[PDB]
Amino acid sequence: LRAAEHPRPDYVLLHISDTHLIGGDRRLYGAVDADDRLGELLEQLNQSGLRPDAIVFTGDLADKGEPAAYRKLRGLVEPFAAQLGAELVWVMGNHDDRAELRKFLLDEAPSMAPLDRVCMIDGLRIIVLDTSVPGHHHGEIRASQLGWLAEELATPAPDGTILALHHPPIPSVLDMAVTVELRDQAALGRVLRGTDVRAILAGHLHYSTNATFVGIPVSVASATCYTQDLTVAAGGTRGRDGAQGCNLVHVYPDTVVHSVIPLGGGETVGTFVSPGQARRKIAESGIFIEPSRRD
Amino acid sequence: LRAAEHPRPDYVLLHISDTHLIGGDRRLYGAVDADDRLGELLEQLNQSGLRPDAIVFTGDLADKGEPAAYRKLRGLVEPFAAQLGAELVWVMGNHDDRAELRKFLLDEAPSMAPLDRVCMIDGLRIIVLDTSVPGHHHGEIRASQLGWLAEELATPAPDGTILALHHPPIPSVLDMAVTVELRDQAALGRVLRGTDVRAILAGHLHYSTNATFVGIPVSVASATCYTQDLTVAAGGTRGRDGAQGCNLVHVYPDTVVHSVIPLGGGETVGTFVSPGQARRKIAESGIFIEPSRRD
Ligand SMILES: Nc1ncnc2c1ncn2[C@@H]1O[C@H](COP(=O)(O)O)[C@@H](O)[C@H]1O
Ligand SMILES: Nc1ncnc2c1ncn2[C@@H]1O[C@H](COP(=O)(O)O)[C@@H](O)[C@H]1O
Ligand SMILES: [Fe+3]
Ligand SMILES: [Fe+3]
Ligand SMILES: [Mn+2]
Ligand SMILES: [Mn+2]
């Protein structure tokens, strides 16, 4: 048997974004049941047997920062995370309310301070940054937050660092996005350049997109509720009930892979290969996959 | 008015992959009309008003390398490219036949030599590499191809280089992919490291995914015909008639952005903003977008 080109990943994370839940049972913007769309995705991820180390939600958790929306989100997601054996990482978006999020999602005293946090998953550092501006929809990072971030990044983590935030430091293909983009990205760039940040996870755009920022890969997950139609007349914008999903993040020794998970379904094309059949076929092709260092 | 954080892009490319057309009118694998799926996408891209510099197809153009499939593909795509004012870049995949592709897609003498090519779009270099192995489905790059590639990359291009190939030098989240992955990626890595390659465009996986390879961003476009369901039981694989589309590539002065374009459609959620309305709203927000250097 010959080894495959890459080993199993060191870490696996789910990257979900822009859930936009509202209080009670009404359709988001009268057009899409955001609870249903998120619920369907979670159930599909659960049934797949995926066992991620962490689940990161990159902002716009509650469409109007409603306590009832946070309570509902927590009720859907906590049992999901527990069933998967995964740590849960929450991030502020422009639609969220810092105080209500703290109270109802985190069981923490209400505060209007930026939701900036750090944690470790074994040797992998996760930094949560709050790009939200209360009462506003564009992104900003205060001088104080940049100082805090620089101080945290003064030393590297063994498996490097994932930075999770809402407003991505990248260009958008949609013109309207500039009205509410992250401002003064140069200042963030000066802080991040040359640090151990291996991935920047973001949302806000409601489509799947990726780029680099000061040499660091940025990955924007699409939304669970509704997504931008990128076949819209050039210059315009149209959200639609379609193409929802999330992302999967695989951290390898030498690279980070981001993959788009659309909602499951659609009629089968080609041959379905069961996990057992796949194991047999791989062996029969004379290949084995080297186990994870964290196996 | 204040300038947006990023200018208009220097270059725009469409990145399409894995069309898998067959001769005649039958459904691909008896399950999906690949002509219809590709046709719908092309018509949507056409109607959007997008004007890309180039359209790059990263392999598996014809499902069984059929002359009739190449003739049909050319008949669909050439008028599309001409209407958009875009250059057309074709790439070999494992399903393609080098000789039939040359004859029927390129009007070139049949040859079984690797389809390795280079061209310029103004100051942007595009290198096409052939990772296919005749009679086989895994990827390989011959020593001779690596030597050719190193020699080409000995000097940089003004806007850097896009490398287009089929089998991506990245891990897959699907176990079965290892049986047909690109072999000996280390050898390619030694050639590419420290060169002006700004993006590696790839296909083969039939899902949207991205990573880095020796510090270079790799972007894998999903397929136009059928795509992998990433909610499949862990370890398994299931292709499905759903989530088809292509990618859009925006080359900026300082970064390259890849964006996923799913098939258009779905009911509108939120407010539709026309291009004219967007221009008005952006101005009213006190912002302008700096024009492209190639405007
Ligand atoms: N009228 C609008 N104003 C600002 N952003 C919009 C508008 N319509 C659509 N968008 C898009 O929606 C994204 C912000 O979504 P959200 O923060 O959920 O409201 C932006 O990045 C834009 O691409
Ligand atoms: N039996 C199989 N053998 C190899 N690859 C498979 C199989 N079933 C699904 N695939 C997937 O299909 C991709 C190759 O597609 P293609 O080159 O179009 O045949 C691989 O990267 C795998 O992820
Ligand atoms: Fe949002
Ligand atoms: Fe293919
Ligand atoms: Mn947002
Ligand atoms: Mn292929």
XYZ file of C-alpha atoms and ligand atoms in Angstrom:
640
model
C 0.000 0.000 0.000
C 1.130 3.555 -0.864
C 0.281 6.562 1.303
C -2.123 9.159 -0.042
C -0.662 12.625 -0.697
C -2.120 14.104 2.479
C -2.749 12.748 5.981
C -6.043 13.030 7.859
C -6.505 16.599 9.160
C -5.227 17.763 12.568
C -8.483 19.668 13.251
C -11.940 19.880 11.711
C -14.294 22.832 12.196
C -17.728 23.658 10.913
C -17.990 27.265 9.721
C -21.608 28.442 9.700
C -22.767 32.014 9.236
C -25.613 34.475 8.906
C -28.431 32.443 10.468
C -30.618 35.588 10.880
C -33.158 33.974 13.233
C -36.112 36.039 14.461
C -38.362 35.712 17.517
C -41.508 33.629 17.052
C -42.645 31.696 13.992
C -42.790 34.227 11.127
C -40.780 34.031 7.891
C -37.603 36.127 7.695
C -38.467 39.252 5.662
C -41.790 37.469 4.985
C -39.987 35.261 2.454
C -38.006 32.366 3.979
C -38.339 30.254 7.103
C -34.848 30.776 8.545
C -35.499 28.259 11.350
C -36.384 25.580 8.787
C -33.334 26.248 6.627
C -30.939 26.142 9.594
C -32.725 23.122 11.091
C -32.527 21.163 7.831
C -28.780 21.854 7.554
C -28.094 20.889 11.189
C -30.042 17.639 10.815
C -28.119 16.784 7.625
C -24.758 17.513 9.313
C -25.832 15.431 12.304
C -26.852 12.469 10.117
C -23.561 12.590 8.158
C -21.581 11.455 11.234
C -19.153 14.402 11.035
C -17.320 14.919 14.356
C -15.811 18.414 14.289
C -13.577 19.856 17.020
C -15.516 23.130 16.941
C -18.437 24.874 15.279
C -17.831 28.562 14.519
C -20.763 30.905 13.693
C -19.363 34.042 12.000
C -22.073 36.561 12.951
C -25.591 37.844 12.148
C -26.945 35.169 14.461
C -30.209 37.015 15.221
C -31.658 39.217 12.481
C -32.712 41.954 14.923
C -30.778 40.851 18.037
C -33.985 39.568 19.649
C -33.692 37.715 22.991
C -36.278 35.169 21.688
C -34.099 34.565 18.597
C -30.988 33.956 20.748
C -32.929 31.570 23.022
C -34.168 29.656 19.966
C -30.716 29.593 18.351
C -29.189 28.266 21.580
C -31.943 25.611 21.820
C -31.261 24.386 18.279
C -27.470 24.583 18.315
C -26.321 23.537 21.798
C -27.807 19.999 21.551
C -26.333 19.759 18.019
C -22.859 20.740 19.324
C -23.160 18.365 22.306
C -24.207 15.452 20.036
C -21.164 16.134 17.815
C -18.766 16.534 20.782
C -17.818 19.960 19.417
C -16.969 23.262 21.080
C -19.180 26.192 20.160
C -17.756 29.545 19.038
C -20.103 32.526 18.599
C -19.207 35.744 16.710
C -20.989 39.145 16.486
C -22.450 40.417 13.214
C -23.961 43.833 12.381
C -27.518 42.520 12.978
C -26.677 41.211 16.450
C -26.995 43.044 19.764
C -23.942 42.682 22.042
C -25.929 42.914 25.293
C -28.740 40.536 24.291
C -26.254 38.065 22.782
C -24.281 38.046 26.055
C -27.403 37.543 28.182
C -29.277 34.978 26.131
C -26.609 33.125 24.171
C -23.730 33.247 26.690
C -25.367 33.590 30.141
C -23.084 36.566 30.693
C -23.795 39.984 32.175
C -25.074 42.414 29.535
C -22.297 44.662 28.254
C -21.878 46.786 25.140
C -18.102 46.122 24.958
C -16.893 44.489 21.706
C -17.272 40.706 21.732
C -13.532 39.918 21.454
C -12.448 36.557 22.858
C -9.709 33.950 22.630
C -9.606 30.228 23.254
C -7.514 27.127 22.600
C -8.536 23.824 21.053
C -5.482 21.748 22.018
C -2.669 23.594 20.128
C -4.972 25.532 17.790
C -5.777 29.111 18.801
C -9.133 30.669 17.891
C -9.502 34.450 18.175
C -12.981 35.956 17.922
C -13.087 39.598 16.816
C -16.108 41.931 16.797
C -16.262 44.017 13.601
C -19.781 45.266 14.464
C -20.590 48.921 15.212
C -23.685 49.364 17.416
C -26.438 51.207 15.530
C -24.572 50.728 12.218
C -24.084 48.048 9.552
C -20.589 48.675 8.198
C -17.561 47.133 9.898
C -14.950 48.831 12.068
C -12.224 47.624 14.382
C -11.389 50.121 17.149
C -7.790 51.151 17.859
C -8.178 49.431 21.260
C -9.250 46.160 19.599
C -6.288 46.341 17.200
C -3.923 46.818 20.173
C -5.489 43.839 21.978
C -5.203 41.719 18.830
C -1.539 42.674 18.258
C -0.706 41.793 21.870
C -2.425 38.399 21.565
C -0.618 37.682 18.280
C 2.796 38.670 19.757
C 3.454 34.943 20.193
C 2.268 32.091 17.947
C 0.244 28.995 18.867
C 1.574 25.463 18.123
C -1.001 24.834 15.347
C -1.287 28.519 14.450
C -4.380 30.666 14.715
C -7.856 30.964 13.223
C -9.285 34.488 13.292
C -13.110 34.559 13.234
C -15.031 37.769 12.481
C -18.087 38.979 10.553
C -17.087 41.684 8.010
C -14.342 40.183 5.764
C -11.209 42.155 4.771
C -11.705 41.365 1.055
C -13.260 42.901 -2.088
C -16.851 41.939 -2.960
C -18.221 41.269 -6.446
C -21.457 43.015 -5.395
C -21.370 46.830 -5.595
C -23.866 47.373 -2.722
C -21.486 45.576 -0.348
C -19.182 48.661 -0.253
C -21.831 50.619 1.730
C -21.419 48.203 4.651
C -17.891 46.814 4.180
C -15.150 46.672 6.831
C -13.534 50.131 6.952
C -9.796 50.903 7.353
C -8.606 47.386 6.496
C -5.059 48.771 6.208
C -4.918 49.094 10.028
C -5.957 45.449 10.506
C -3.430 44.425 7.818
C -0.553 46.048 9.713
C -1.485 43.966 12.782
C -2.009 40.633 11.007
C 0.927 40.662 8.576
C 3.576 38.060 9.450
C 1.635 36.538 12.395
C 0.574 32.873 12.823
C -2.961 33.540 11.521
C -3.584 30.627 9.096
C -7.212 31.415 8.213
C -9.639 34.288 8.581
C -13.213 32.986 8.811
C -15.905 35.480 7.886
C -19.525 35.931 6.769
C -21.593 39.053 5.937
C -21.595 38.634 2.136
C -24.198 35.806 1.928
C -22.241 34.076 -0.876
C -19.222 31.740 -0.899
C -15.989 33.591 -1.553
C -12.311 33.529 -0.667
C -9.172 35.608 -1.152
C -6.037 36.587 0.715
C -5.484 39.548 3.001
C -1.859 40.563 3.686
C -0.935 37.019 2.602
C -3.459 35.280 4.883
C -6.281 33.182 3.376
C -9.753 34.611 4.017
C -12.753 32.284 3.729
C -16.290 33.702 3.650
C -19.044 31.199 4.329
C -22.402 31.777 2.677
C -25.604 32.061 4.767
C -28.023 29.452 6.143
C -31.081 31.645 5.580
C -30.872 33.147 2.055
C -28.005 33.852 -0.345
C -26.981 36.351 -2.998
C -27.741 35.441 -6.610
C -24.480 36.004 -8.483
C -26.270 35.839 -11.848
C -27.987 39.146 -11.003
C -27.711 42.000 -13.538
C -24.169 43.402 -13.152
C -24.102 46.203 -10.559
C -27.282 44.994 -8.819
C -28.134 42.698 -5.907
C -30.810 40.069 -5.270
C -31.086 37.770 -2.262
C -32.843 34.454 -2.860
C -34.234 31.363 -1.189
C -31.633 29.023 -2.614
C -28.004 27.894 -2.376
C -27.931 28.006 1.450
C -25.390 25.923 3.370
C -22.228 26.284 5.415
C -18.489 25.549 5.175
C -16.223 22.793 6.455
C -12.687 23.678 7.587
C -9.910 21.052 7.652
C -6.660 22.088 9.331
C -3.734 19.986 8.025
C -0.056 20.178 9.079
C 0.826 22.322 6.042
C -2.433 23.853 4.769
C -6.008 24.786 5.623
C -8.808 23.531 3.360
C -12.192 25.260 3.160
C -15.068 23.412 1.513
C -18.587 24.545 0.695
C -21.419 22.342 2.020
C -24.665 23.198 0.207
C -27.884 21.797 1.597
C -27.951 18.044 0.944
C -30.229 16.458 -1.606
C -30.832 16.226 -5.314
C -31.259 12.985 -7.223
C -28.240 10.668 -7.314
C -25.935 10.933 -10.345
C -23.410 8.152 -10.897
C -22.826 5.398 -8.348
C -23.405 5.936 -4.615
C -20.390 4.639 -2.668
C -21.074 3.674 0.963
C -18.336 4.285 3.590
C -17.672 0.509 3.766
C -17.470 0.210 -0.026
C -15.116 3.203 -0.153
C -12.746 1.618 2.378
C -12.653 -1.549 0.263
C -12.127 0.370 -3.037
C -9.311 2.514 -1.594
C -7.469 -0.602 -0.342
C -8.060 -2.309 -3.725
C -6.452 0.725 -5.408
C -3.363 0.074 -3.230
C -3.695 3.224 -1.101
C -4.038 4.060 2.586
C -4.683 7.427 4.273
C -2.182 8.310 7.029
C -3.964 8.898 10.357
C -4.321 12.299 12.008
C -1.684 13.415 14.497
C -4.649 13.982 16.860
C -6.253 10.575 16.150
C -17.216 61.031 -1.279
C -14.850 58.478 0.317
C -13.173 55.708 -1.678
C -14.218 52.123 -1.054
C -11.564 49.836 0.462
C -10.763 48.168 -2.852
C -10.640 49.379 -6.460
C -12.356 47.663 -9.385
C -10.415 44.517 -10.377
C -7.565 44.536 -12.921
C -8.869 41.324 -14.559
C -12.018 39.220 -14.401
C -12.163 35.552 -15.408
C -14.886 32.963 -15.413
C -13.697 29.621 -14.027
C -15.915 26.772 -15.227
C -15.169 23.081 -14.850
C -16.250 19.496 -15.341
C -18.892 19.964 -18.045
C -18.836 16.208 -18.904
C -20.755 16.545 -22.189
C -21.542 13.408 -24.199
C -22.319 12.868 -27.888
C -25.995 12.997 -28.851
C -28.999 13.744 -26.657
C -28.888 11.203 -23.800
C -28.629 12.049 -20.089
C -25.169 11.854 -18.504
C -25.005 8.529 -16.617
C -28.744 8.288 -17.418
C -29.408 10.823 -14.649
C -28.777 14.466 -15.628
C -28.950 16.434 -18.857
C -25.437 17.918 -18.834
C -26.181 20.035 -21.931
C -29.184 21.601 -20.181
C -27.278 22.352 -16.984
C -24.370 23.977 -18.842
C -26.738 25.807 -21.208
C -28.792 27.234 -18.336
C -25.634 28.521 -16.615
C -24.241 30.082 -19.815
C -27.547 31.827 -20.540
C -27.674 33.196 -16.975
C -24.067 34.464 -17.204
C -24.848 36.014 -20.583
C -27.961 37.793 -19.261
C -26.072 39.155 -16.218
C -23.968 41.460 -18.440
C -20.658 40.157 -17.040
C -17.737 41.001 -19.367
C -14.812 38.777 -18.373
C -11.328 38.973 -19.908
C -11.196 35.181 -20.207
C -13.195 32.027 -19.574
C -11.130 29.105 -18.255
C -12.521 25.523 -18.333
C -10.467 23.376 -15.918
C -10.936 19.946 -17.534
C -13.313 16.974 -17.964
C -14.866 18.817 -20.885
C -16.179 15.660 -22.602
C -17.201 12.750 -20.380
C -15.720 10.135 -22.732
C -13.621 12.393 -25.003
C -16.166 12.029 -27.818
C -15.640 14.116 -30.988
C -19.427 14.836 -31.019
C -19.192 16.132 -27.422
C -16.286 18.464 -28.315
C -18.163 19.758 -31.388
C -21.234 20.437 -29.233
C -19.186 22.074 -26.468
C -17.476 24.329 -29.019
C -20.877 25.221 -30.547
C -22.286 26.238 -27.158
C -19.229 28.002 -25.762
C -17.575 29.852 -28.658
C -20.621 32.091 -29.359
C -20.911 32.671 -25.579
C -17.229 33.740 -25.388
C -17.563 35.933 -28.502
C -20.702 37.646 -27.108
C -18.817 38.376 -23.857
C -15.650 39.570 -25.659
C -13.677 36.981 -23.683
C -10.720 34.769 -24.550
C -11.287 31.043 -24.211
C -8.892 28.785 -22.290
C -9.360 24.997 -22.440
C -7.729 22.503 -20.023
C -7.466 18.667 -20.116
C -9.169 16.488 -17.506
C -8.913 12.713 -16.935
C -12.121 12.088 -18.948
C -10.844 14.004 -21.977
C -8.927 12.628 -24.956
C -5.894 14.734 -25.962
C -6.110 13.871 -29.673
C -9.876 14.365 -30.047
C -9.764 17.580 -27.994
C -7.025 18.949 -30.281
C -8.915 18.016 -33.457
C -12.437 19.035 -32.535
C -12.037 21.767 -29.933
C -8.803 23.397 -31.173
C -8.617 22.638 -34.927
C -5.125 21.316 -34.272
C -3.387 18.193 -35.539
C -4.125 15.184 -33.321
C -1.300 14.541 -30.868
C -1.051 12.608 -27.614
C 1.475 15.078 -26.114
C 0.374 16.742 -22.839
C -1.835 19.783 -23.406
C 0.564 22.330 -21.845
C 0.217 25.903 -23.094
C 0.932 29.499 -22.143
C -0.650 32.797 -23.077
C -0.846 36.441 -22.026
C -3.896 38.578 -21.331
C -2.222 42.008 -21.308
C 0.199 41.661 -18.322
C -1.472 38.585 -16.815
C 0.100 35.226 -17.666
C -2.051 32.090 -17.908
C -0.307 28.703 -17.904
C -2.337 25.619 -18.804
C -0.977 22.336 -17.435
C -2.143 18.804 -18.293
C -2.389 16.603 -15.180
C -4.164 13.838 -17.151
C -2.654 10.383 -17.752
C -4.013 8.665 -20.888
C -5.914 5.489 -19.975
C -5.939 6.494 -16.278
C -7.915 8.749 -13.924
C -5.385 9.847 -11.309
C -3.188 12.886 -11.916
C 0.511 12.996 -12.767
C 2.873 15.660 -14.015
C 5.821 14.247 -15.992
C 9.403 15.274 -15.199
C 9.490 16.908 -18.663
C 6.377 18.980 -17.877
C 7.877 20.076 -14.546
C 11.061 21.190 -16.357
C 8.999 23.129 -18.921
C 6.973 24.751 -16.138
C 10.091 25.739 -14.146
C 11.632 27.300 -17.262
C 8.456 29.292 -17.981
C 8.274 30.474 -14.356
C 11.977 31.524 -14.344
C 10.753 35.090 -14.898
C 7.546 36.683 -13.571
C 4.741 38.396 -15.502
C 3.700 42.011 -14.697
C 0.349 40.942 -13.160
C 1.668 37.553 -12.047
C 0.457 34.173 -13.213
C -2.644 31.992 -13.097
C -1.934 28.261 -13.317
C -4.890 26.248 -14.677
C -5.028 22.448 -14.355
C -7.502 19.654 -13.584
C -6.293 17.581 -10.578
C -5.761 20.021 -7.647
C -2.694 19.825 -5.357
C -4.862 19.853 -2.198
C -6.456 17.414 0.286
C -10.057 16.316 -0.347
C -12.758 15.820 2.288
C -13.991 12.793 0.302
C -12.057 9.557 0.925
C -12.651 8.129 -2.595
C -10.835 11.129 -4.091
C -7.441 9.676 -2.994
C -7.764 6.866 -5.599
C -7.589 9.451 -8.396
C -5.731 12.382 -6.799
C -2.690 14.181 -8.241
C 0.370 12.061 -7.384
C 3.815 13.346 -6.281
C 2.630 16.866 -5.424
C 5.983 17.457 -3.692
C 7.675 17.659 -7.128
C 5.192 20.295 -8.344
C 5.634 22.170 -5.034
C 9.398 22.448 -5.540
C 8.756 24.080 -8.938
C 5.992 26.471 -7.851
C 7.384 27.682 -4.515
C 8.441 31.346 -4.613
C 7.254 31.971 -8.213
C 4.724 34.608 -9.392
C 1.835 32.101 -9.434
C -1.032 34.013 -7.739
C -3.777 31.400 -8.189
C -4.062 27.751 -9.124
C -7.415 27.068 -10.803
C -8.580 23.469 -10.686
C -11.576 21.123 -10.953
C -11.902 17.315 -10.622
C -13.529 17.267 -7.161
C -17.067 18.336 -8.237
C -17.469 20.511 -5.109
C -16.323 24.040 -4.214
C -13.114 24.035 -2.213
C -9.960 26.054 -1.669
C -6.644 25.824 0.166
C -3.019 26.782 -0.287
C -0.233 24.777 -1.875
C 3.353 25.828 -1.051
C 1.864 29.210 -0.086
C -0.133 29.654 -3.312
C -3.952 29.850 -3.194
C -5.683 26.931 -4.923
C -9.303 27.361 -6.021
C -11.357 24.341 -7.111
C -14.517 25.150 -9.028
C -17.444 22.771 -8.690
C -19.010 21.122 -11.777
C -21.704 22.266 -14.223
C -23.172 18.777 -14.607
C -23.554 17.225 -11.119
C -21.862 17.826 -7.764
C -20.781 15.930 -4.671
C -23.177 15.936 -1.719
C -21.054 16.915 1.280
C -23.779 15.787 3.701
C -23.115 12.178 2.635
C -22.390 9.611 5.380
C -18.783 10.257 6.489
C -16.342 8.174 4.421
C -18.780 7.774 1.506
C -19.528 9.612 -1.741
C -22.707 10.563 -3.603
C -22.973 12.707 -6.724
C -26.247 14.582 -7.179
C -28.279 16.692 -9.566
C -27.980 19.863 -7.534
C -25.648 22.700 -6.526
C -24.113 23.048 -10.015
C -22.486 26.325 -11.063
C -19.088 27.844 -11.735
C -16.647 30.349 -10.202
C -15.814 33.993 -10.834
C -12.198 35.157 -10.471
C -11.354 38.820 -9.778
C -7.678 39.768 -10.008
C -6.962 42.913 -7.940
C -3.617 44.733 -7.525
C -2.970 43.027 -4.168
C -5.193 39.925 -4.042
C -7.177 37.400 -6.058
C -10.832 36.806 -5.146
C -12.653 33.586 -6.035
C -16.439 33.525 -5.781
C -18.899 30.680 -6.214
C -21.726 31.261 -8.723
C -24.485 28.685 -8.167
C -27.182 28.392 -10.794
C -29.386 31.494 -10.616
C -32.909 31.418 -9.280
C -34.873 30.915 -6.109
C -37.563 33.263 -4.852
C -36.433 36.769 -3.893
C -35.634 37.393 -0.212
C -35.294 40.995 0.939
C -35.296 43.915 -1.488
C -34.084 43.559 -5.089
C -31.678 46.408 -5.902
C -31.352 47.271 -9.607
C -27.938 48.422 -10.948
C -29.279 52.004 -11.265
C -30.684 51.959 -7.725
C -27.380 50.587 -6.415
C -25.405 53.416 -8.036
C -27.731 55.943 -6.389
C -27.572 54.221 -2.946
C -23.759 53.976 -3.001
C -23.449 57.708 -3.803
C -26.034 58.506 -1.085
C -23.866 56.553 1.388
C -20.990 58.913 0.458
C -18.853 56.280 -1.294
C -17.324 55.784 -4.732
C -15.484 52.758 -6.170
C -12.068 53.571 -7.688
C -11.916 52.515 -11.357
C -9.849 49.605 -12.649
C -6.309 50.258 -13.846
C -7.444 48.516 -17.067
C -10.688 50.535 -17.372
N -29.611 47.835 0.609
C -28.499 47.166 1.002
N -27.575 47.761 1.794
C -26.459 47.125 2.201
N -26.169 45.859 1.862
C -26.999 45.137 1.073
C -28.244 45.766 0.586
N -28.880 44.839 -0.157
C -28.106 43.725 -0.155
N -26.982 43.896 0.576
C -25.942 42.850 0.777
O -26.129 42.264 2.061
C -24.888 42.185 2.758
C -25.124 42.557 4.210
O -26.084 41.659 4.733
P -26.609 41.789 6.240
O -25.460 42.295 7.077
O -27.204 40.457 6.579
O -27.715 42.848 6.177
C -23.952 43.186 2.109
O -22.608 42.691 2.154
C -24.503 43.361 0.706
O -23.762 42.557 -0.211
N -15.638 5.166 -7.752
C -14.970 6.345 -7.773
N -13.655 6.391 -8.096
C -12.961 7.546 -8.125
N -13.506 8.739 -7.839
C -14.811 8.849 -7.497
C -15.638 7.627 -7.443
N -16.880 8.016 -7.093
C -16.845 9.361 -6.926
N -15.614 9.865 -7.164
C -15.265 11.309 -7.074
O -15.230 11.852 -8.391
C -14.048 12.624 -8.580
C -13.502 12.341 -9.967
O -14.510 12.675 -10.903
P -14.292 12.458 -12.474
O -12.831 12.700 -12.765
O -15.305 13.329 -13.149
O -14.635 10.983 -12.714
C -13.053 12.177 -7.528
O -12.244 13.288 -7.122
C -13.913 11.598 -6.420
O -14.088 12.564 -5.384
Fe -26.080 38.652 7.212
Fe -15.116 15.510 -13.508
Mn -23.886 41.180 8.062
Mn -11.810 14.557 -13.207
